[PDB]
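[job 0412] stage=complex_fold ligand=protoporphyrin IX containing FE status=START
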Amino acid sequence: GFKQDIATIRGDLRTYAQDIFLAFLNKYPDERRYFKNYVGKSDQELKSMAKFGDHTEKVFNLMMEVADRATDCVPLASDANTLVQMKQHSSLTTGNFEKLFVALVEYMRASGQSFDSQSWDRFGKNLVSALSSAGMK
Amino acid sequence: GFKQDIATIRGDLRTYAQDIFLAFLNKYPDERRYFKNYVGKSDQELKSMAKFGDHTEKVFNLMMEVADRATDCVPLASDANTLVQMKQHSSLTTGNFEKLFVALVEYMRASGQSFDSQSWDRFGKNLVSALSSAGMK
Ligand code: HEM
Ligand code: HEM
Ligand SMILES: Oc1ccc(I)cc1
Ligand SMILES: Oc1ccc(I)cc1
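[job 0412] stage=complex_fold status=DONE, emitting C-alpha cells
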C-alpha cells in the first residue's frame, strides 16, 4: 500500500527520482522553463549531470518525508506551508504541483511495480488543497 | 457517503444524538462515571431530562462541524486542539473517544439507513490520532 510504496521508492530513490522527474518534464514541456540548466538537454544528458541527480533526489527525499508524515494521505499543514514559502517556489501556482502528481501517478500505473496509485492520486489532490489553504495561488 | 451522512444526522440531530450517546453509555457502563446525573437511570428517564438532551445535542452539533471541516476523514489540527483543551475533557484519554466511535459505528451498521460506516470508522481513528498529537494521553 501507501506505506510500502514509500519504502519502495526510498530503496532506490536516485533511480525513481530521475525517471519520474523526466516523465514530468517531457509530459509538460512548459515546466522545464523553471529549471534553466535543464533546457536543451536530452534525457541521457541530464542523467549524466551531477546536479540533476542530486537535485531530483533532494526533491523526492522531501516528498517522501511529507508523505510519511501524512495521515490517511492528508499532509500536515506545516509541511504544506514549508513548500509554499520555500524561495525556490515563490513563483509557482498549484497548477504546477497538480501536473507533477499526474505524471507521478501515470508513471506508477505504467510501471510493472505494484504501487498504490489511487492513494498517490489522493495524496496529490490533498497536497494541492493544502497548498491552496496555505496561500498558494 | 461521509458528507451525505453529516447531512442526514443534522436533519434529525436531537434524535440521532440521543440514541447514539445512549448506545455508547449502555455498551460501556463505566463511561457513565464521567456524567454524574446519569447513573441509575433507564433510557426513557434520561430522555426526559432536559439537561441530557441539551448536552448530547451540543456534543453532536460540534462533532458534525468537526467532521464537516475534515478533509478525507482527517480532522483539522485546530479542532483536535479544541477538544483536548476543553475543561470538560481535562480528565479524559483517547480511550474514551475510541469507545464512543466504536459505539457510533456499531449503531450505524445496526440501523437501516445507508450510512458509510467505514468512513466513520476511519474518521474516529484519525481523530483519536489527532487527539494524541494534541497532547491527550
Ligand atoms: C511536494 C512536491 C515538491 C517538493 C517536495 C519539492 C522540493 C524541493 C526542494 C527540497 C528543493 C531544493 C533542492 C536543493 O536543495 O537543491 C526544490 C527546488 C526547486 N523546486 Fe521543488 N519541490 C516540489 C515541487 C516543485 C514543482 C511542482 C516545481 C515547479 C515545476 C518545483 C520547482 C522547483 C525549482 C525551480 C527549484 C529550484 C531549482 C533547482 O534547484 O535546480 N518544485 N524543490
Ligand atoms: C469528538 C467527540 C466529542 C465532542 C465533539 C464533544 C463535545 C462536547 C461539548 C461541546 C461539550 C460542552 C456541552 C455544553 O455546552 O454543556 C462537552 C462536554 C462534555 N463532554 Fe464531550 N465531546 C466529545 C467526546 C466526549 C467523550 C468521548 C467523553 C467521555 C467518554 C466526553 C465527556 C464530556 C463531559 C463529561 C462533558 C461535561 C458533562 C456534561 O456536559 O454533562 N466528551 N463535550
Ligand atoms: O531540482 C528539482 C527536481 C525536481 C523538481 I519537481 C523540482 C526541482
Ligand atoms: O453531554 C454530553 C453529550 C455527549 C457526550 I459523548 C458527552 C457529553
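Chain A is about 70% helix and 0% strand.
[job 0412] exit 0
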